[PDB]
């Protein structure tokens, strides 16, 4: 019962806003989402979390994650996307249940051109 990250690939042109959708089986209703960017060497970078944690070391208004009123899914948006931003992105859900697993979604690609 892991989350799913869509679309498999979206392209935007050196600016504007690019948004992905991550959907999850919100059973417990007491959990956290992380939004990661995986480097070409399979190294991961944590871009955001819902709910938000701290804006000190992790300061970047570029990546917003917002919850939609339906509850099942969430929007992962990069605002005004620089060409540095193009890369492979992934979703991750964690449930605070005593096992505290991290259910993990699939890759998704993002391009920026024009």
């Amino acid at each position: 019962n892991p989350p799913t990250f869509s679309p498999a690939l979206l392209v935007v042109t050196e600016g504007d806003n690019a948004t992905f959708t991550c959907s999850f089986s919100n059973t417990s209703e007491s959990f956290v989402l992380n939004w990661y960017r995986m480097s070409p060497s399979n190294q991961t970078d944590k871009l955001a979390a819902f709910p938000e944690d701290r804006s000190q070391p992790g300061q970047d208004c570029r990546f917003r994650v917002t919850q939609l009123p339906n509850g099942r899914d969430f929007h992962m948006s990069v605002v005004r996307a620089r060409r540095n931003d193009s890369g492979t992105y992934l979703c991750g859900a964690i449930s605070l249940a005593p096992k505290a697993q991290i259910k993990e979604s699939l890759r998704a690609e993002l391009r920026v051109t024009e």
Partner: antibody
Amino acid sequence: QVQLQESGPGLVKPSETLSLTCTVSGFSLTSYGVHWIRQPPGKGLEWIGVIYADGSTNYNPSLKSRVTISKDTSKNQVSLKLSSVTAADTAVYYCARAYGNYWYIDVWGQGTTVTVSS
Amino acid sequence: DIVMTQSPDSLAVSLGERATINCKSSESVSNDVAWYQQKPGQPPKLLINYAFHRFTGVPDRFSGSGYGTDFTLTISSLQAEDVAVYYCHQAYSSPYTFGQGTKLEIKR
């Protein structure tokens, strides 16, 4: 090949100013923050400070104002200066890279050992 | 500040068995905890990042779990090349403190 190498005096006399340098290969200091971490003999790791990508610094309060971290990107070099040292400061000093937004320390230098002694 | 406390201080487990080291935070930290191993004379090397993620290139027997205040490093089938000291490290609020370290020695 993301690399950090430290260099500095192996012996400093007490109350001197101790200066170490960390030369970087495989990334630019404009995009990555660099931390200085310290390890006394047989003791644990102590976080000294960090210079972020932009250039804002942040130190450990136990080093109230004796510590200063700077960088020169042209030389790919990060420098640590600690004033008014005592024998409580002899330790191995590592420089290390912080990776990603919401960061973690991934690559460590080999560490250079500094002894404070008259 | 924030103090990370590891348990136990030292730990001796036979080969092929499972080894767990625990790390607890005074102030709640939301998964910004990394596990590093360090053997004598070499620098610390990163094992786990983001409390759960196995870093790139580190063997499959290393795993991390936990969130908020309780975290566990777990080596599944411990083998000889894992004798070291293990440190948790929080990147949540400055000063970004470390754990005291747990020496993992193996029984033979």
